[PDB]
Amino acid sequence: EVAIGIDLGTTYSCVGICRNGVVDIIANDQGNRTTPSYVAFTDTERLIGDAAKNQASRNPENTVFDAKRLIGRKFSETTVQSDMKHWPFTVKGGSDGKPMIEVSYQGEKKTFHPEEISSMVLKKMKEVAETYLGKPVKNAVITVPAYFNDSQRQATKDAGAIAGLNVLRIINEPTAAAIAYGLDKKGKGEQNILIFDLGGGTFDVSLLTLEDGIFEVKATSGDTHLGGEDFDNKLVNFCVQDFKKKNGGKDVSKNSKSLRRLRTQCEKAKRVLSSSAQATIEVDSLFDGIDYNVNITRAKFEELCMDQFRNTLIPVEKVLKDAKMDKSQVHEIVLVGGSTRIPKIQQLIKDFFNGKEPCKAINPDEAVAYGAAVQAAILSGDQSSA
Numbered sequence: 195e196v197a198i199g200i201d202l203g204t205t206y207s208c209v210g211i212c213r214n215g216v217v218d219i220i221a222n223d224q225g226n227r228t229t230p231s232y233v234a235f236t237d238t239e240r241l242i243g244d245a246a247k248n249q250a251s252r253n254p255e256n257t258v259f260d261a262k263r264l265i266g267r268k269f270s271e272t273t274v275q276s277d278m279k280h281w282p283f284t285v286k287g288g289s290d291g292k293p294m295i296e297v298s299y300q301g302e303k304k305t306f307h308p309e310e311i312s313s314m315v316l317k318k319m320k321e322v323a324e325t326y327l328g329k330p331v332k333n334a335v336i337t338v339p340a341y342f343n344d345s346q347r348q349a350t351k352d353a354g355a356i357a358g359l360n361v362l363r364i365i366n367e368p369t370a371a372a373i374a375y376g377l378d379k380k381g382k383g384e385q386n387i388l389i390f391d392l393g394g395g396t397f398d399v400s401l402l403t404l405e406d407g408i409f410e411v412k413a414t415s416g417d418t419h420l421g422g423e424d425f426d427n428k429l430v431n432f433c434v435q436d437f438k439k440k441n442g443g444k445d446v447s448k449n450s451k452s453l454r455r456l457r458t459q460c461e462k463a464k465r466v467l468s469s470s471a472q473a474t475i476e477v478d479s480l481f482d483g484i485d486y487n488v489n490i491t492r493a494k495f496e497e498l499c500m501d502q503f504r505n506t507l508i509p510v511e512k513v514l515k516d517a518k519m520d521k522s523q524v525h526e527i528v529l530v531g532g533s534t535r536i537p538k539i540q541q542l543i544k545d546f547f548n549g550k551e552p553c554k555a556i557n558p559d560e561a562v563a564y565g566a567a568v569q570a571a572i573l574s575g576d577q578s579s580a
């Protein structure tokens with residue numbers, strides 16, 4: 195009877211429930227409204243979510259993330275070959291051509307298919323909802339990117355089944371974000387909706403049309419390797435160079451643990467810069483026992499990321515061209531993904547759309563789970579959100 199909506203994200207996942215027409219995004223054990231899509235294996239335990247992400251730099255080989263980039267893919271795909279440079283964990287091809295993620299767990303070599311790793315994240319999101327409701331949850335709607343093919347969708351459904359969920363439906367992420375804002379209900383006329391989704395690792399722009407409660411994905415574009423992690427890397431590259439100029443050419447980049455610790459602090463400073471004009475990046479005993487400290491203004495962060503930020507408009511122009519429409523014909527621009535909190539990005543989109551205010555009332559990293567939760571309630575017989 196109880197049905198949840200789950201955004202199974204590349205970097206972060208989110209769970210929501212829609213009851214009585216109202217949507218509650220459920221916080222985890224640490225009070226976090228989103229949970230890292232991370233699974234780690236140690237000498238004693240299997241960690242999922244925050245606990246797994248928090249020990250990633252101390253256990254890189256056995257901390258799995260990015261399974262969404264592998265789910266439903268053949269190991270031989272050029273996407274896998276290219277992405278694997280970014281992973282400290284080992285991925286090999288099985289005899290069936292499916293990827294096998296190799297880790298050490300309790301002193302033993304273990305292998306997992308991408309959907310087994312995703313099933314563990316889904317099981318954690320199921321448990322987050324169960325703790326909140328105080329009751330078992332069996333039904334769920336899971337979202338996937340619009341471009342996911344049949345193999346990727348089926349593998350995501352299989353991940354749900356393995357996690358103990360009865361997957362009522364797999365729906366598109368941009369469509370879920372649009373449903374969250376009630377854009378299917380408010381206004382009977384045809385509506386052209388642009389979903390601008392900039393997360394931790396990917397950038398997806400989708401142009402939808404809504405006529406009479408029916409959403410159709412007219413055009414999609416983006417960049418599978420542009421997200422918040424790339425803005426963190428801009429700060430890391432700067433700090434590495436700044437450390438060199440301060441400490442007689444010493445190179446932090448030679449130590450991968452020093453880089454990971456610096457990256458952690460660069461992402462924290464980046465988030466602060468979304469609501470403050472300045473932030474401090476500080477790592478005590480970063481490299482060679484030398485403490486590192488630097489102050490980054492929002493202006494300097496904007497300068498380091500200038501091309502990357504402006505280039506987010508290129509896939510916006512591409513979807514409008516593919517759909518044969520002018521930017522003036524877009525009725526609503528919905529900001530999705532944690533990176534859409536960056537003021538410069540919001541200003542760039544607003545200027546592009548000639549001063550139109552984007553829909554950002556829903557926490558952008560929760561809008562997809564919010565829409566999935568609405569759809570889960572509808573598919574369960576609850577018409578209260580309408």
Ligand SMILES: Nc1ncnc2c1ncn2[C@@H]1O[C@H](COP(=O)(O)OP(N)(=O)O)[C@@H](O)[C@H]1O
Pocket residue numbers: 203204205206207228392393394395396421422423461464465466468530531532533534535536558559
């Ligand atoms: N306040 C903020 N300012 C800038 N970036 C922020 C932010 N809050 C979250 N983010 C970024 O959002 C990204 C994750 O977005 P999210 O939408 O949860 O991840 P995803 N692609 O798995 O679905 C991370 O790179 C994180 O640094």
